[PDB]
Amino acid sequence: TTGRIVAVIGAVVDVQFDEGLPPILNALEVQGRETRLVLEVAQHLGESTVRTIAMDGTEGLVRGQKVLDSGAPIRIPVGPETLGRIMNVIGEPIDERGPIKTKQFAAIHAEAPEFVEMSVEQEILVTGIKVVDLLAPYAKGGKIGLFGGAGVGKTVLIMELINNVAKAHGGYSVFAGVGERTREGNDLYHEMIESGVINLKDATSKVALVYGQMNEPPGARARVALTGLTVAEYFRDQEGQDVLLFIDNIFRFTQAGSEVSALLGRIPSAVGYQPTLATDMGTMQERITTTKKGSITSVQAIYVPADDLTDPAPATTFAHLDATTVLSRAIAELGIYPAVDPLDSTSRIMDPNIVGSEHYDVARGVQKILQDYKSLQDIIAILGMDELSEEDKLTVSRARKIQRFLSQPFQVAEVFTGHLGKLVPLKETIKGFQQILAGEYDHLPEQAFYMVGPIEEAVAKADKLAE
Amino acid sequence: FAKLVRPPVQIYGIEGRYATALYSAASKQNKLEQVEKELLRVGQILKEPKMAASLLNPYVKRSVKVKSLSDMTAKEKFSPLTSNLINLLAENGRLTNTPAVISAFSTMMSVHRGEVPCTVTTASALDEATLTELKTVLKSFLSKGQVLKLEVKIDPSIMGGMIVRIGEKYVDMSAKTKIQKLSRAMR
Amino acid sequence: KTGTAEVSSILEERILGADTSVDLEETGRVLSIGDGIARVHGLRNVQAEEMVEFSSGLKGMSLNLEPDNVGVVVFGNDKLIKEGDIVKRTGAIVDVPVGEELLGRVVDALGNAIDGKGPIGSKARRRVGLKAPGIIPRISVREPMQTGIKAVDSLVPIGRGQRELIIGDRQTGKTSIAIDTIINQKRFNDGTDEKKKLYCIYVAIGQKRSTVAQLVKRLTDADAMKYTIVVSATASDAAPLQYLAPYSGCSMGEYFRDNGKHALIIYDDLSKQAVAYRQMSLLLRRPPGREAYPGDVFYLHSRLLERAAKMNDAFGGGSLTALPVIETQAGDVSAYIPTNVISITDGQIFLETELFYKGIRPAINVGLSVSRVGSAAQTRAMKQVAGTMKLELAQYREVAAFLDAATQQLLSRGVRLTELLKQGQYSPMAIEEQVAVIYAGVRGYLDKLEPSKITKFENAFLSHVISQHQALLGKIRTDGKISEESDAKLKEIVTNFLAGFE
Amino acid sequence: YFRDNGKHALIIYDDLSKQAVAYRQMSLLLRRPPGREAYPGDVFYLHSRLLERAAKMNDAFGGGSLTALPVIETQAGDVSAYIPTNVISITDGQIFLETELFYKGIRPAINVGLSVSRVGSAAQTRAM
């Protein structure tokens, strides 16, 4: 069916079909362009006319051009051949490597898993990172949230999570770049090519990048997280495996939604956000869950505008987060990498009903000792080490040892430190910390633990540097 | 809803919607020409002082106006389409702009039979042999079948030459614009 | 100006008289679906708030009966609706199935089971847009609704028919209190006396569907599902469903209230209903107000929380408690909605977040938590104990701002009591064990225990009395009050147990 | 033109918070729906599709370049207003200027605490 354009108001087109309208969310191809312009219906205005939001620049459109209705919502290729590729919102590769030859196609607008599908057991995703898997465990099919700014090792942590999940759980990953600066998009592409998660030679890549640039019209920055979700839903459903999904950033998702809502004329809500803020976030955060076929974990970067944790966007996101990972700069000066802060990083599953009593007691002990050391830090700074008894200096020594032991050498970060990547399993982390707390290693120099994997390697390092 | 046949030209607003509805309904049943005849008739029938006075007062109950229109449309013996349209306009309260409707419909029928508007604004008075050559040359712009409806206009306000409009296509060879163009170029 | 039924596709039908063929008194055609509302043309015989059914199997209700075209809110995703679709009446104000054929089922906001266990084979359909009981049917709140939580039962007692309010910042222990209250009714629901059995309803509004699934699994893990309904309009569900969910639940509960039985409905949570309603309004162009909430976001809750009444013997003696949950923002209990709901309910339960960080779980903040009506409805044993526990904590809270041995004594008492008031999770204790432990605490016997050790004492104590002294607890429960001889016993048992605890 | 002709350019918009105002007028008069602070919904697309032309082409497309130094005026250090945050989330840095520093005598009044550059160590000579 072929309709005709009848209005082009900014980035909102209005098409006048006659024979039969397309149901909302169908993708229409605008005939007569050279770059593929794709509109997406958003309303029916009566009189066989539909108000479509355009997914690309709408300069040069002529009242009367022919718009051909595809039939189903925006469709993308979702095979395993979408791995190591970059593709914009509509599924067209932008890596200048050719077509994404796949036999499957998936619509980006698919409803969330039904209630029967949902899995009722809250598991724990073993990331292989000591601090993360100990104090702020990541949950399968849980929406983690990664705070912290730039310069603190966020891209490195993303690449490490990708690599560790690809090795341990044998599950691929995705990266939906909502509103992703073009410069940083290129830098991330080349960082992955370096670290080796993407591989241009053999088709053994572990990431399926997806970029909705920061300059693409607002209607095509809201529907990029959905593209990532579909590429990952293929791996969960059609291959039954765990998956990651990084949405950098998840404030620009709400920003794009707000701009689209304003364009469609809808009254703005509380703080200028769209009236459908909560449901727009829900119908996208509700496909990130653990069904019985597989699971889609998700590590979503969060920007908190003006440090307002009440602001409707970071207040609507936090209603879904199942974790947190507050990368901090103050912990990067010490060199403890990853910079993950241990006292801010929350997690909803850090409860002895889920992780287990041993895990919970160990993690709570680590938190308490670190809090006590942070407090004694003030007394030492003000008055001096003399002011403390040994009942406190022992906790100080243990706390310094723990702060050291939380640092880990990532595999992708070999270029920086040279050390080898250590994928310490969960049990080894638990034993190491349970023992460092039991005083069993109060004599080894702190630098025994700095940048090691298990505790046994810390013992070996102490022996080496002690001779 | 039921498929409807679009007009050749699009008119917009209230009159646009009503004229489009009437034209599509008339194309079915093929009553276009007699529909236009009846539209012209209602044109005058809605200009008699009593009718044009009772169809402006808003204190005449709506049903009263509808019934008076029905009675008048029995005497004039209109087609079912035109009587239904007059009724429709009556009870929607939009009869105050009936002249807008029919006028639009005329523009909808003119293009249907293919009589493209034209116009020739002249520097001053014009001969009629010159008008003959003008028509015979403008017919060179139409498509195969169209007809020319040229409305000449005298204009001494321009300096020389002429301004020719054909549908939209607008060709300006008046000496006035040449003078301002030259002054612009050499300034 | 212009019209909305003044479209070509309609004026054509009307001009050539074709409308005689298509029914308009009992069937309409969607003029335009957009912004989650459908302008529908026809349906001349549609009653306001009727429940019309689209041609895609969807269902909506007619809000605006504008003179030329109805306006219909679609209970679902309008993705499925297209201009031109045919909408059919149903001749029934929007209503929902009710009965005891729903117990143990999960149903979406409209009564359609979503646990894949077959249709809800019910017979009665009750409206959702009903009125609340008038002035006369009600009487005071007399029976107690045993929460199973030490703090709630001791210091913030809840009656039956009393609208409580679990209000507090997110991730604080609201859903946990609701689940404890829903699991603690298992003991009462395994007898014969209909005067005790309490049937629970849990409405999950704008709440992650994984969370509701885990909640249902956790309930069935404790056979606390044989007597619970779970209405579920989660985050994904279109706003109109999140809007109806509380009314569907409240109607499924009124069915019990009107038939001499006692129910207990937990809205989790009304703030997300209010957000969904604000969306529904702002998409209908209605004017915004304070925080953009419509003017009537108070006649949205009141007409819902006023049905949680306590009928009197004349009408059946039924009941319907209600424990609406509210998620204040950072710390503001003066915002629009927290205040709009604090003035509709008969109580409050403030779950402070600082307390929750400091390990005092449940985080129930006392002093800011009241139950204006629950005092008249409280087992006299728990009254004999609370009458002094509240006093001791009140004295403690004054001396908590800073000593002679008087204030040291008061601090010791307060710390011991608060350390008692902690509790696990999904481990509700019958009222007899509550009176035992709270008595052994208030009467000073725990003054000679290191604060941290109370957290253990309690545990052990329970076991020692759950086995050895069944008879004493039986007497306390049956008599409802600590008889002087029962006091003498409790005293000697606590002394003997304390002797050799260490 | 320079950038894609293998040359190096540098473009300084001054201000951009007046292009945004001009566009707001153009829109409000065309009757397009307004938004926060009355700016339309495009006042991000507006700037973004501008400040994203500042590139550094590779050596196959010429090796050209185009820096960009959009100047923004903030009403009394209100960096949280609409346009300042719209244009702070598009660019790779910010050189914050303050008037407490301008009158203490620290001229140019740059405020190294808030000023950052997200290329950082790179974009300097080994000496510097």
Ligand SMILES: Nc1ncnc2c1ncn2[C@@H]1O[C@H](COP(=O)(O)OP(=O)(O)OP(=O)(O)O)[C@@H](O)[C@H]1O
């Ligand atoms: N009495 C308790 N003892 C120990 N832990 C508790 C207690 N109550 C709640 N928690 C813990 O607090 C965390 C959050 O609790 P809860 O599920 O009540 O959140 P909430 O208050 O309902 O807010 P949300 O709506 O975000 O869930 C859970 O991990 C739970 O285990």
Ligand SMILES: Nc1ncnc2c1ncn2[C@@H]1O[C@H](COP(=O)(O)OP(=O)(O)O)[C@@H](O)[C@H]1O
């Ligand atoms: N495991 C690590 N070991 C040593 N250095 C690290 C580690 N992780 C991050 N870093 C340092 O942090 C910086 C992070 O930069 P990059 O990941 O490119 O962007 P961002 O600073 O936003 O994370 C790197 O330059 C690196 O020197």
Ligand SMILES: [Mg+2]
């Ligand atoms: Mg909750």
